[model samples]
Target: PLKVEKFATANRGNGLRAVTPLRPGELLFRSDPLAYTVCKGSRGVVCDRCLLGKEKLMRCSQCRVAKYCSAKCQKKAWPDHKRECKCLKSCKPRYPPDSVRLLGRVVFKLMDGAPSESEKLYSFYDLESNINKLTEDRKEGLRQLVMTFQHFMREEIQDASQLPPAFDLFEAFAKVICNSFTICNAEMQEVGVGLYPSISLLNHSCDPNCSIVFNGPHLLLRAVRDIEVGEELTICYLDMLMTSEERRKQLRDQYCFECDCFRCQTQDKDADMLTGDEQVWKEVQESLKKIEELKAHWKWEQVLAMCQAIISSNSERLPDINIYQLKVLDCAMDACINLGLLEEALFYGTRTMEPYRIFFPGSHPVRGVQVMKVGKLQLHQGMFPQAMKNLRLAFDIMRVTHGREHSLIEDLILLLEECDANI
Candidate 1:
């Protein structure tokens, strides 16, 4: 029960604001999906309902359309899967894509009628579709999807007439879905997708005060930094590591708005302070491309040399805000460690921390791995106390993000014990 309010705004309409001051790591809001689907590619690999690994799966007897880990998961999934089972069987031997499957679920949910009196807070209708806001080309693209869906549903439904109402609103569904849905599992690696309209109400910012985490099917929107009351809650819709221009272009193209957030406004101020020419930046991009090519061939020595050369010569020109600089530092860290340059790896790995800390959540697995990498380097360098601290922090995050049984966590535990022995 978060003290939050939803309202229309002048700049970013239909936005969410805090009614109370929020603290860091506090749970601001959570919601189950209105409707969701298991991605098509993940069908055979993971359980459709729970999304956990399934070594042995029991296929749904009627349609053979879904696989579950156990009788428990099968039973839990029956309400949703039962409706789609016959439809799936009819559509065989080929199946619809994940998007169509998701749309079908939404259509079924709508046909089931509005949320009950007890379930009043759940509302999908009022969510902004921005269908009219789309370009003619994008609208045509969505119309093509609607045609595919209409073919699929016409075969499944008893009355073909019920579908026109659904089809008439499919573009709006597409828009709400495109703008509102977030990946349901950690790092979005898992198959499930959830729609939380309450959570979607928050506007976008390149530098956001809040971070969203997926705890299995449930979403926990936590404050990464303390947010003041009346300050509009924001989350980044685009990658924070991307340049301001790249981010703005992506937002405009995909989300239909340009951001004028504090971070976006201030991003290039430091670059303006540097006297580096455009040709210098162009050369850096070319050097980075060569490093990437070298990396693909397992040419670690060459990769390390190029990254080190770029950093040494263009240290001032390589601003921290640029994604290219972060990428180069990441490459240097990896290549230096692989080529046995411990001190250089330690230097580059340390430099990567600041940018990553700003860009990624504390529980993000990439940040966890980066911390462990630094800790591993410190252990080898015999910085026992510092190594122990970082290893413990990385372990806590990796256990949740990657799970307790992950090989990365197994290695991290052994390293922690080694640090304990030394200390």
Candidate 2:
């Protein structure tokens, strides 16, 4: 339903895939904070007003790289800023501001021992090897670039004692262009536009309905579609909600590697059988899209009814209830009760809570929500003691995650109090 237009096409051996569909402002790609930070090493968090420290920050006035806590601070820091300012001002690529921003937030902390070191080292060898593999017309250009990088590396290596901690980084970067490698990254944002190109070509698996949303610098992955029966499940590697096994399988299957995780190891083999394609799981995804389309028209009643229908129609299809399906079913359950469809509501609730112990960690908020629902059903059943136990479990679960201050925590307290009185 969502459309992407701006993209770059890249060939992945088998065929070329379109990658850069991200708009100028759209998030292209983003790496995990841990990964990026490790690449960056220690860095200052830029203050909106001050680029320089209140802590250790580089301030430049001419090419304005640093920020000041205040104008007074800026003036006081000017004497120290003049030299860097000149460098910033002289920095080229006078076109897009992003180019300049990329320079300013320069990745300076690259470690020599990054996992990608061997790749970088081999990249150097690959460059010269490819020179003979090129045509006469293109060989000259390749030769010139390789010569320039070779010169830079020679100089850096000669001055190895004076080399900064990011020497490997500078060397590795030189190899990127010299080898003419097309490797790229992509960035995506859930709430707003993102503009980074890291890993953007891993196409959609209809079952993949799960995505990681970039909330600013943070990443949160949730099910965007309810993965259904016999579907090729795919998840954005950048997502956080994936089980380790799912994460590993996707990585290995698509990227060719094996992944081992506790859940993957413990998961039932029968429930995790491989499906042929992604079509079987597509129905749930289509239903979700239909619901979203209906919501846009302010059809609250229809939204609820459709969601309920979706849950009921596909209830038996999923092998194990994952977060994707549960989200859809939960929404339906919420709506069904509000609309007084008690029987259907109860069915949705039952599906949601069954095997609750395995679906989420005992302390997860979803578990807490399930507890409250069971208590609600028990209240209608007039089973006060059982209702009280389920309700109390929900309270305990919420407390584990949301803490005492959460609204859900307060709601649970009220429910428990009421349950006590009724008992």
Give the best candidate by TM-score: 1
- What lDDT tens digits, residue by residue, belong to model 1 across residues 252-317? 767888777776787744353223456666677778889877764446798888888878874456
- Report how far residue 401 has shifted in candidate 1, in Å: 11
Q: What's the C-alpha lDDT at position 68 in model 1?
A: 86
lDDT of 2 by residue, 185-299 (tens): 1111011111122223233331234333332333332323333332222333422234455666554433433443334566533242322224534566567677655543334
**In order, what lDDT does every prediction score?**
0.70, 0.42
| Total colliding residue pairs, candidate 2 | 29
RMSD of 1: 6.9
Q: Give the local distance difference test score of model 2.
A: 0.42
